[model samples]
Target: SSLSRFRGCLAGALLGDCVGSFYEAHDTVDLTSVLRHVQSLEPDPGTPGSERTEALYYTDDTAMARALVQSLLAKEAFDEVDMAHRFAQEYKKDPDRGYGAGVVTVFKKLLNPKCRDVFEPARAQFNGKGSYGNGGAMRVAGISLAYSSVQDVQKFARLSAQLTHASSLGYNGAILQALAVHLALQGESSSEHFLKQLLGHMEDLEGDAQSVLDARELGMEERPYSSRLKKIGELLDQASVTREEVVSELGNGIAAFESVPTAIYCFLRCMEPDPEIPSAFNSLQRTLIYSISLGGDTDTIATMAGAIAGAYYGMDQVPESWQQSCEGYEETDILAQSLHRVFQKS
Candidate 1:
């Protein structure tokens, strides 16, 4: 049952990911719109008539997540070298799978001889501020699943973030979100409590990490989206935060921190204690649906929420239909098993 639960999480996450991809570029689907028509596998009305009407598929985000899962299956711990190569290999196989500009550029450089030099700017660039983009956060849920122990979460989060996202800000956000999910799995914590505890946990880390520092300074109580985004913006005024202030400030689509933290916050908003966990599946689904309907970064938002839902509700709570329609089911299954094994080992 536990194994199935994990599989539900993995399956639900990928399903949401693929379904959201079809609606990626649009911006006006409120929560009510989702109620009208939920996540899809076929192109909806706004989707181009030119686009294929067949079952939709996932994008680079899920592909990269698969790579993360595969890494642990091959080796108990993360391997940076392998991660780089795997990312490049997958991107090279198809350079246009909805990858972000920053990532696409890096991939092109990595593929070249004279042109190849992603490791430097890929490590540096992002206007010297380095991207706090959602790239790292997108695939981070696997780390949450892979390492059951709280300490191992931060460790894996760092290793996973460093693979492509070397920015300290980016890495820190991933760690925080991963830790949030980790804490959710281990025990009951309210959304306010979870965000507060994570911010509190950041005290020991170097003060240079902006998100961590920002989290420390963020008020204890959760506020309206506008107010929260405003506070987050204040934190970024000096260093320049992600695209938006809070998840809204950052653009909740694909930037790792943006989408990841948004998902965590959404989960924190809906999550409840144990026996209440399963009952909240609809709440979790509704939250993710609300996120998707809000648009902008739909796929990433749903993916992140799916991760939280899986951990909080486990697999049985995931919709069987969503599980069946998901693309790459075989691949996801293999990865989920690997994650469970690695988690147990920890």
Candidate 2:
């Protein structure tokens, strides 16, 4: 059962990244257009040429995530050096997966023999102002599933994030994402309870003196993510909220503060399919389509949302055809099962 959820989480994230890569940066994507596109992916059985097609291909989001999974599987404990090397190796092998400019530098730095600390390059970013990008959070689902305890989720997720994202917003967002996945794995299927649990976790996280100190070191405002969570709650209450409203309030950028909460919101909003979405579509499908429809940074947002949705619904909820259409589906499934094995050991 846990293995199914694990498979769903990674496979769903890869599927979302692949499908959502089609519309990564447009501000006004037509929901119907993406929906129709996603729906049309299931080819007709009678059609001769319809038997084979490549509808989706994963991006840098899935690529980096694969690196994380590989490194985690290779180590008994969290191997920061091995993880850093994996990141660099993955980046070098496929530099066209749409890696962020900031992260590119981090990878390059990791390849250098003189670089003692893997986190130093990230710390040196923006003239000593480390990146607050969602790159960390986007690739952290593996850490959540690999570890059984909440303490390990927080600990390793933070370490995994710091490999390329040194800011509080960056690493903290990873923690939140991992926690979301951890909660989902525990059978938290209700939207209300899920958000409440997240809020409760945030309260403790923000209250921690170390976190407060990190916030100060990063020169960030207090409770930055919790403030965004509050905004998420507010926006979730409104009916017929536009994409513009979501982007304006929650943002759709590369920044963790701009995107992680938006991803969480997408997952929660798709818990119940809207009337426009065909009831025939499962929640996993709806989650991917709805996340991509938001437009900017579609791959990462959908990747994050898909991980959460998949953790909740398990692999059974995802369409088999959709799984077949995405690149690296088999590898994703294998990684998910392997992660589940690691979780079992924990």
Candidate 3:
């Protein structure tokens, strides 16, 4: 038998991260260049005319998500210090795995033999400012599958964010993203309805992450992807939206409000159902299409979309060929299966 709904969710999330990597960091956000408008698995690079296959590539987003799955399989719950160490260890092994600057700095410090896993006021960047990046949301699909109920989901997800991300804004992002995925696993939401639930949950939380909040609002507006992308692009250009824009204008990864939530909002906008939304078996391909379609931070954006799609869709939605081509070898297979167990039990 298959690993349960969670396997589908978990696999779906990671598949998106890896497959969408090719199109990451593109200048134009239009997805057609990468995806031939169909969701079929593009030829793996090493295969025949393909140049980059055999070594399936992934990024920081999938790495962190895998870490979360590892931690859960071993401990049955999230351990902040341990999780931080795990992240640092991955970085130490290879920094080229596509992590953001802010996270890379913190990971370096955590890898230091003498440094405590806990964040200290002495850390200049997060000392007061906090991380306003999308790191929190990037790895949250694991949390979404680990917990069964909303209350547990909220608790564990919040705790998971605080493990590395300390800012309330950053933590808030994790909370929202985790919750969104948990709901998605229930097989109960329209793109609009799911986003509405997310926005409503954030009412009491600090609205510091405007980019994230705006994403949900924009997602629920019921518009076509082209129109929505155009509006979002104009706003981002005119408003000077940075990875930190959510933190500066809203918040950063240091807090729940800063990091993960914003990614969730952006993803919701992508998943928001529209009659015009294109179809593809490759949800990640679809996500990459949109990520490129939107332009900035294509990899991370695609990753965020993958988590949600994995939760809402399933592993079956992903192509087996793509799964066969992934790079992580031992770790990815183990972590993906572990997460699948959790999803099934739920």
The TM-score leader among the candidates is: 2
Q: Compute each candidate's TM-score over C-alphas.
A: 0.75, 0.93, 0.72
Q: Model 2, 1-346: lDDT tens per residue?
A: 8878899999889888888888988877898999877767777865432232545778889999999999989995679999999999889888998889878988988988667888788888877767789999999999988888999999999999999887777888899999998988888877778888888888778887756766676456777678778888888888888878888888888888788888899988888768877888998888888888888889899999999989989999877777877888888898888877765632
- The predictions' CA RMSDs to the true structure, in order, are 7.9, 2.5, 7.6
Question: How much is the lDDT of residue 197 in candidate 1?
Answer: 63
Cα lDDT, model 2, residue 275: 83
lDDT of 3 by residue, 1-346 (tens): 2354565656555555676666655545344555552334456546532233445578888778887778787776767667777877877887898777776777777787677545541134455545645677778878867667888887878777665566554666677777767777777646556655655565545444643453354245221212222333343434334433432332222233332433444554444332334553344445434443454455565566566666666666655555555566346656767766655442
* Candidates by TM-score, descending order: 2, 1, 3
Better of 1 and 3 by TM-score: 1
List ranges where model 1 is wrong by over 4 Å.
39-54, 111-121, 187-189, 203-206, 209-254, 272-281
**lDDT of every predicted structure (CA atoms):** 0.61, 0.84, 0.57
lDDT of 2 at 67: 94
Candidate 3, residue 78: the lDDT equals 68
- lDDT pick, better of 1 and 3: 1
RMSD of 1: 7.9
Report the lDDT tens digits of candidate 1 across residue range 243-269: 233445445655454566566655654
